[PDB]
Amino acid sequence: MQIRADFDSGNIQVIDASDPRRIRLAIRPDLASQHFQWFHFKVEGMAPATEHCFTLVNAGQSAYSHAWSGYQAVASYDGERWFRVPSQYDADGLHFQLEPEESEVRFAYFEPYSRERHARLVERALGIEGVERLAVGTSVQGRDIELLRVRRHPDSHLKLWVIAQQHPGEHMAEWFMEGLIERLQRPDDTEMQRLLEKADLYLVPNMNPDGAFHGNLRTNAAGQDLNRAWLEPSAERSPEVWFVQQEMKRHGVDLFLDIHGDEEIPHVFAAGCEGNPGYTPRLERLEQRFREELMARGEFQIRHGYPRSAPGQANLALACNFVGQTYDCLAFTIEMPFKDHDDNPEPGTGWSGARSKRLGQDVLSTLAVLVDELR
Numbered sequence: 001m002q003i004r005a006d007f008d009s010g011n012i013q014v015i016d017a018s019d020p021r022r023i024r025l026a027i028r029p030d031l032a033s034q035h036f037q038w039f040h041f042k043v044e045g046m047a048p049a050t051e052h053c054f055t056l057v058n059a060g061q062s063a064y065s066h067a068w069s070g071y072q073a074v075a076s077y078d079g080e081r082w083f084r085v086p087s088q089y090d091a092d093g094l095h096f097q098l099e100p101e102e103s104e105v106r107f108a109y110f111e112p113y114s115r116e117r118h119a120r121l122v123e124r125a126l127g128i129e130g131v132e133r134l135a136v137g138t139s140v141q142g143r144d145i146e147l148l149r150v151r152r153h154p155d156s157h158l159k160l161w162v163i164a165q166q167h168p169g170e171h172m173a174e175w176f177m178e179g180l181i182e183r184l185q186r187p188d189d190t191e192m193q194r195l196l197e198k199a200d201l202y203l204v205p206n207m208n209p210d211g212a213f214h215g216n217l218r219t220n221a222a223g224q225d226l227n228r229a230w231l232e233p234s235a236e237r238s239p240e241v242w243f244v245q246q247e248m249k250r251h252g253v254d255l256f257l258d259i260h261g262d263e264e265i266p267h268v269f270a271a272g273c274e275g276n277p278g279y280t281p282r283l284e285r286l287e288q289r290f291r292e293e294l295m296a297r298g299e300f301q302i303r304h305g306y307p308r309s310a311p312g313q314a315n316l317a318l319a320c321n322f323v324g325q326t327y328d329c330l331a332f333t334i335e336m337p338f339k340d341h342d343d344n345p346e347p348g349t350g351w352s353g354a355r356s357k358r359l360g361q362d363v364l365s366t367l368a369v370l371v372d373e374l375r
């Protein structure tokens with residue numbers, strides 16, 4: 001048996017794989033930061049009719065170690081069909097078991113979104129009516145940060161922004177973007193016709209290509225948490241954010257959605273700008289409308305989430321808060337679970353790429369309903 005992670009988004013350190021009943025592995029810290037939680041590795045040469053038992057020995061020292069409870073690892077024999085495996089968490093770490101039907105299998109913290117798939121997503125987007133690559137930024141390591149614009153009418157007046165995966169380990173984020181973009185291929189989509197008559201979409205499928213490729217969880221190549229870099233961005237340390245901010249200054253913003261994934265909470269939720277000094281009655285109302293409409297259409301709830309910010313106590317270094325206040329627009333962080341969306345249990349897969357894609361499509365329906373109220 002051999003274990004490796006020498007591929008896009010791979011992350012693992014092999015401790016000892018000599019005994020199938022006691023496979024010991026360790027998660028690797030981010031390129032330039034102590035954070036870690038995301039893991040992705042491949043196993044080959046496994047013996048048939050043999051139970052294999054894995055342990056991520058340093059799970060207890062991960063960035064969000066409390067989030068391991070209730071979490072089931074994801075696996076795949078072909079890289080296309082992903083399924084959850086029996087998992088437990090204790091002082092020795094995260095454990096999971098599988099009696100593989102095949103000699104090779106891969107495991108990951110979430111269904112991975114490769115940079116190769118990303119290129120295909122962009123390729124597909126550019127083949128869609130009204131879609132153009134408006135601008136392209138460059139990451140610390142030279143990778144592209146495409147900003148796509150969906151514009152089908154020269155007289156639209158609203159700019160709706162959606163960016164994803166600032167935190168590289170939250171792969172559900174780009175899956176959400178794939179679903180959103182793929183919906184644009186539909187003929188006779190009445191809701192989208194209405195939306196695009198009044199608005200243009202500004203999309204960034206992946207905000208941290210370096211981190212994703214390298215299997216990071218939280219930071220870009222330089223070790224910066226991009227979602228804490230908005231108040232003081234740097235063309236050198238956080239070029240990904242510097243880029244988006246420059247483009248926002250050029251075009252304007254009337255709506256902002258920052259797509260993320262949360263390790264702990266087993267529910268899809270959205271966090272707003274209630275702590276912003278600029279949190280006006282207008283924005284408070286729009287936040288209610290957004291949640292009300294999305295809850296009626298997609299896998300989304302309003303009971304569970306992050307503790308709200310006291311009036312005026314928001315951290316303006318976070319994208320949602322920064323963009324919302326700078327542009328006086330409706331702004332949310334959309335958070336999808338690494339576990340399952342417990343309101344609609346599907347244990348075999350837990351939250352998945354497919355469900356992330358669907359949420360992207362349901363969010364589009366929600367935007368179509370609110371477009372007349374954004375300004």
Ligand SMILES: [Zn+2]
Nearest residue numbers: 167170260261
């Ligand atoms: Zn995040």
